Symmetry: D3
Subunit: 158 residues, 6 copies
């Protein structure tokens, strides 16, 4: 079980929020220029640090959006691997715990996710900065659960 | 935030907005974080803005909770200054449960001015409320709720006092 | 509009979108006007898109109605091409009522392709639908509903062939 | 004594001012409203009626919730709102849903039965919603009786 | 109603029947001009929504037997089935898998929204909005197998009115 | 405690009330840092812009300098927009004098405001809509009135902000 603070709710529209850690305020990072909304609730695991000096970020697949700033207890089921202009980028894929939503209980690996959801997610990431000057993403592959858990542990320990 | 404002008004912190669908939020009393308690499974949403009175303590070990009857939803984590007008009494699988029923103060909304007692609320609204609590956990294993009655304004004020004094 | 879209597909005109609040709409066959039936008094919303099959006739004189399981709501009056996968069987105060359960054809949403019967639906969702039907009329006097069970696809195809044949 | 009202503009909806084309039966965008105001009530008209201005009799339907544009609410008139604008007198029936549709309005028999604040909010909307249209304005002169509304209704059905 | 509505609201102006609102969800609606029924064409599979209000001019026939299409650039979404009177300012030009496709770019008439009065040619539209429209059309079929779209370029107002006239005369 | 200025001409603005957001009039309580419901507003009017204030500022009314952020979309309450001041909306109510800074997002947030550097660059109807809002949003609150007395320019705005920063 990991705690994930949500920055950006699924299907929310053009606003790209980001938490300032120095203050804990939610800042507007960007007013997004495409017609794309985030495919998943999106946030981070508090008290963790990626090698990029930032927290471990997370896509929480849920059936519903959630107010920015709310926390979802989830479990990691995988990892989405990307490289952006700032280099390499990994995002955990997680789902609510069976206390929050029992209907995800049979979802144990990426394998168990809708294929189309997964493609929607790649398509989103590969395109949502297209109209952002000086910015881009490439999706190089996926990791499994064991891979997700090691990322988290390394990020807690860092 | 204190349990009470002026003129015997209470501060109530909103966890869940009225008619707001399936997310059941709850504030972590420790860290002050807004947590997702559940993604609720029925097709019901709360009939009221729902929250708690800060700086209070129930026998259950949590803040006195409150249903705010209002004409409009409010973002979660926002604070409505209200007057208590009653109590909803329940029993669930784990014991007794009471919820204050409050309305906004006339300074937030003058249209509630003439609502001083429970008998002043919409009759359907009151049944909507009981219906909500008696059924919204039906798809949750082992959970039940039964409304056993209502208390009056004094009853509420006493509950609130005890909650304050108990902190 | 014809009831049938292909061999094993139906047209369904949506009156009430999934998760859409208190408004309960019903189309007036005569006028073809969409009327407000009631403002519902519980905190329940439709657990999915709900409508009927144009050009069909139930044993009750009304058309054959369907709950269309979908990923999203649809505007009332709009028409979804589906395939029947089952049926929900109920009784209310006015006796028997059954509803076809359907999913969008795979042309409209391929994520539904692998759902061919009721048992391929989310168990919670099925539980959600029943719970709704069993309680959404609770605060309306002299009104009630009990779910007596489900029928399978064959059973649904037969209710549709009937209502067309009638 | 019950009326069918086809709704053009749902309470609290954005800026889109819809207008029924009687010719075609289509829903036209009359205006993208320039102010920050939203309709205070669901608004439309009674089919197969006909007012002095040669337009259908139009109705504000006080309800607790919005309805999609084009849908029809069975209602019963309780009063009339009387106005004049840059073009003369305008009057609007105030109706509430039948008790079949919403039993919570059962006790609403006259205008006096309405929230004073709703009545005020209505007046203000009308007096102000066209402020940013050049040359246009509205002033509310007063309110009519339920018999005034029925009369009005009677007259629009007959005029038709 | 699709039959009772004229294609031109007068000399400047076209009646456009909206099928899909701006910034609307995944639902891709299409009027069937047989029955005038609104059909769900598809539940779109990407995270994209339409960047403007989308519909067609009644009483027109494109070369391909459909009506003439219009993206109505507007400040706000309208309800599907509703009609807006606009005036054309351009056309967008592309190629999908099934050949050529041009769509008319229009704005409301100044009677509907006077804030559009100074918008006369494409050059007057926000550049980011134009890029956003292109982007949309180039990508919103990406998850639909065998489906593709390239944007060829833009036509001017004269091109647009030529398109309208033709479709009318056709 | 968020900085007033994100840098030498940009300001941080904490949003209380989203554009087009309905009847809820929120107000942050400084002492608690809690988002309070101030009013359930009684007319059918919504805010024309995202509205809030600059932290760490203090006006003469003993409240922080408050801002209308013209933007294409509402943003959640409590969220912070980085912007740049382009003018001042100058008014009087029953309490006396009042000024609201008019800001737009920085070009990092939204490049489409890039070309908007003075009030005359704004849609005239938008400006008409903002004035109308303020001059009527309180008509149904007894005793309350507002008169828009005019507009200030960027220099003016930028002075107000400077003073509000120095005064805090």
């Amino acid at each position: 079980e990991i705690n994930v603070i949500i920055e950006i709710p699924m299907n929310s529209g053009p606003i790209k929020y980001e938490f300032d850690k120095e203050s804990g305020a939610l800042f507007v990072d960007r007013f997004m220029q495409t017609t794309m909304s985030y495919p998943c609730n999106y946030g981070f695991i508090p008290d963790t640090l990626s090698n990029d000096g930032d927290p471990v970020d997370v896509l929480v697949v849920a059936h519903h959006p959630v107010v920015p700033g709310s926390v979802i207890k989830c479990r990691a089921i995988g990892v989405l691997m990307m490289e952006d202009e700032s280099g390499l980028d990994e995002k955990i894929i997680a789902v609510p715990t069976s206390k929050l939503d029992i209907t995800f209980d049979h979802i144990k690996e990426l394998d168990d996710l809708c294929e189309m959801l997964k493609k929607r997610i790649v398509h989103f990431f590969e395109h949502y900065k297209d109209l952002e000057k000086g910015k881009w993403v490439k999706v190089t592959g996926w990791g499994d659960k064991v891979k997700a858990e090691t990322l988290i542990k390394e990020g807690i320990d860092r």
